[PDB]
């Protein structure tokens, strides 16, 4: 796939990583 | 070996595309029978026993001492800027062998697709092996023989 199409997967991976960092943080405070 | 026969079928197609007058094939009983059938049917100009370096001019007895260096040399025919032997393909493949009764061979020669084998076309040669002998399908039907459908030459 071209760079243009790769960029869509890049955004999805970024948002998943951002959400998992956010979830981690919560667990630390709630723990 | 059907693998060796597949190699020879592909080799002859390659030689026809470049229009070489003479080429060599492995020296085995099956190859010799295959080549002889093509020669009698007018696909090959010549059929000579020989060595890796070329056809033998004088008879050279084949023994274990020289068996590894033996080859069969065949002459290809070209008329009107067209190869006489244009295509050569196996029907019965190493990983899927096809054995047909004489009744089904008659259907194949009559225009009926049997076991996905496209029927015999005008001017095409289909060879059959029965009891380690290679013959034309029309000849196998005459002798009431059942056998493996090996290849089709056009």
């Amino acid at each position: 796939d071209s760079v243009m199409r790769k960029r869509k997967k890049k955004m999805k991976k970024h948002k998943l990583r951002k959400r998992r960092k956010r979830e981690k943080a919560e667990r630390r405070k709630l723990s | 070996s059907l693998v060796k026969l597949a190699n020879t079928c592909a080799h002859l197609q390659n030689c026809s595309k470049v229009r070489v007058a003479l080429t060599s094939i492995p020296y085995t009983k099956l190859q010799l029978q295959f080549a002889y059938n093509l020669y009698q049917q007018g696909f090959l100009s010549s059929l000579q026993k020989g060595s890796t370096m070329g056809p033998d001019k004088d008879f050279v007895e084949v023994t274990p001492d020289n068996i590894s260096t033996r080859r069969l040399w065949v002459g290809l025919k070209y008329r009107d800027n067209k190869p006489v032997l244009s295509s050569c393909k196996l029907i019965s493949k190493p990983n899927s062998r096809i054995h047909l009764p004489m009744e089904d061979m008659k259907k194949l020669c009559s225009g009926v697709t049997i076991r996905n084998i496209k029927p015999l076309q005008p001017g095409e040669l289909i060879l059959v092996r029965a009891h380690n002998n290679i013959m034309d399908i029309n000849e196998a039907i005459s002798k009431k023989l059942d056998g493996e459908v090996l290849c089709r030459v056009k």
Binding site: - | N95, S96, R97, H99, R115, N116
Partner: protein, 235 residues
């Protein structure tokens, strides 16, 4: 008649009077348009417990003998499985004997080398006394001892030459004899074949009946068998 199958014993000695036999049958697979072999393992009754893993056997249908047993061994077509068991037992005994013999030949060789290391006398020095005593006339008792260290009772110039002989020398002469034989056999047959008249006579002289009426290959083999019977039997 009762349905009979051929198969290879794939398990034995795990159940009492029961063996597992692998039967392969030929079927047509319409989807891929190919005649395939279909495999199935059968639990089979072995009344005499004769079959062994690896054997080729014929199994015959029988009455129900158990929940899963409906066939019995009817004949051992090939007994490769039984052979394996016999050869394994023999191997243990055969190898033990050979290893014992080789262990005794190794300790003996060690002893001989150790004994020689206890004799300070060296070949060079000993060969320098047999060549000085033989050139000076002195006969110290060392020579008598040397006549025992080597067994050379007589001390002459042709005794030191036989103490220092190297195997390579013998090999060089055996190789020349081998080369001669091959060369002679080839020249003889080559010449014989060139002259049909001398060939026909050659065969008759060696006891062939009407050699003239023979083929090239049927007669050249006779010539070869004779030329190799006139250069290897007489020598």
């Amino acid at each position: 008649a009762r349905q009979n199958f051929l198969g290879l014993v794939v398990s034995q000695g795990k159940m009492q009077k029961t063996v597992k036999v692998r039967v392969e049958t030929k079927v047509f697979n319409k989807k891929i348009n190919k005649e395939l072999f279909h495999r199935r393992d059968y639990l089979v009754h072995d009344e005499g417990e004769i079959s062994r893993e690896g054997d080729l056997v014929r199994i015959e249908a029988t009455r129900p003998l158990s929940k899963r047993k409906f066939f019995a061994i009817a004949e051992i077509i090939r007994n490769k499985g039984q052979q394996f068991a016999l050869y394994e037992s023999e191997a243990q005994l055969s190898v033990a004997k050979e290893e014992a013999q080789k262990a005794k030949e190794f300790l003996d060789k060690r002893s001989v080398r150790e004994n020689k290391l206890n004799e300070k006398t060296t070949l060079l020095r000993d060969i320098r006394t047999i060549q000085d005593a033989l050139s000076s006339g002195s006969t110290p008792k060392e020579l008598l001892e040397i006549k025992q260290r080597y067994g050379i009772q007589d001390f002459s110039q042709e005794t030191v030459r036989q103490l220092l002989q190297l195997d390579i020398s013998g090999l060089e002469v055996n190789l020349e004899k081998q080369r001669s034989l091959i060369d002679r056999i080839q020249t003889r047959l080559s010449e014989l074949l060139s002259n049909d008249l001398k060939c026909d006579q050659f065969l008759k002289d060696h006891g062939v009946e009407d050699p003239l009426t023979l083929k090239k290959n049927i007669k050249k083999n006779l010539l070869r068998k004779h030329v190799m019977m006139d250069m290897q039997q007489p020598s």
